[PDB]
Design a protein around this ligand. Structure first.
Ligand code: GTP
Ligand code: CA
Ligand code: MG
Lengths: 167, 77
């Protein structure tokens, strides 16, 4: 089976780890323990095909930003995650996407914009349309709101990246 | 930087923070749990770079602070 190198990116506290662990282990991480570097692997059936996924879960805050260049080069697909309850995390994604494009030099890179923590509707400070508009602005980049807690659109983030990869 | 990089089964890896007082089992508990791995069913080794990747087995109760900067590997028994 073909292997897919997926990278989960985004600012601190958005739920990159919670989403990843929910997808791989099917459990919800309630505590917030900042990631330094973590990789997971999961055998998954996408479109009736066996796929081996290698997911790189990244640190929301890197002392040396240049470290990101290293995993973006190897990464095939990228998930840009922000929290709908934190505006700054949504605004931080612009620089991240430009860094991804700067590393590959190609304006075409399979990715998905993810507005996480959608179960916290009362604390929403980033609109759904607002996120959909950013995605549209990013050359019709895929978009979805998810919840690592309520298990909403968790699998979809990764399944979609695989679809984009096999072009 | 008080960290340790650890290579895990199924070609996975994790870098964990080490706080004085923690044993090896303590620093790796969460990383193993979220991957469905159990320490009692695994052996942990210290990679010996001065001897071309040779592995040296460690006790799970080893003082973690003494391993800062070391690269470890966890294999199943
Ligand atoms: N309610 C809710 N909480 C979530 C969700 N996803 C994550 N969290 C919580 O948000 C907090 C931080 O989660 P992490 O998954 O550690 O986020 P992170 O992006 O990996 O942060 P860093 O590794 O430091 O960059 C934790 O306390 C989680 O339990 C979600 O969908 N809903
Ligand atoms: Ca070393
Ligand atoms: Mg994390």
């Amino acid at each position: 089976m073909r292997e897919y190198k997926l990278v989960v990116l985004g600012s601190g506290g958005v739920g990159k780890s919670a989403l990843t662990v929910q997808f791989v282990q099917g459990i919800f991480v309630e505590k917030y323990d900042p990631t330094i570097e973590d990789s997971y692997r999961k055998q998954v059936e996408v479109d009736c095909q066996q796929c081996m996924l290698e997911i790189l879960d990244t640190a929301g805050t890197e002392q040396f930003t240049a470290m990101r260049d290293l995993y973006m080069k190897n990464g095939q697909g990228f998930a840009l995650v922000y929290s709908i309850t934190a505006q700054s995390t949504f605004n931080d994604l612009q620089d991240l996407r430009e860094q991804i494009l700067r590393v590959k030099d190609t304006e075409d890179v399979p990715m998905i914009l993810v507005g996480n923590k959608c179960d916290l509707e009362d604390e929403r400070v980033v609109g759904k349309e607002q996120g959909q508009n950013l995605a549209r602005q990013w050359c019709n980049c895929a978009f979805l709101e998810s919840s690592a807690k309520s298990k909403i659109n968790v699998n979809e983030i990764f399944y979609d990246l695989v679809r984009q990869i096999n072009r | 930087s008080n960290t340790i990089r650890v290579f895990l089964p199924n070609k996975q890896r994790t870098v964990v923070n080490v706080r004085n007082g923690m044993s090896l089992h303590d620093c790796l508990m969460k990383a193993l749990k979220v991957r469905g791995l159990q320490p009692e069913c695994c052996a942990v080794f210290r990679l010996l770079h001065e001897h071309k990747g040779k592995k040296a087995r460690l006790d799970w109760n080893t003082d973690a602070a003494s391993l800062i900067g070391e690269e470890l590997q966890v294999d199943f028994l």
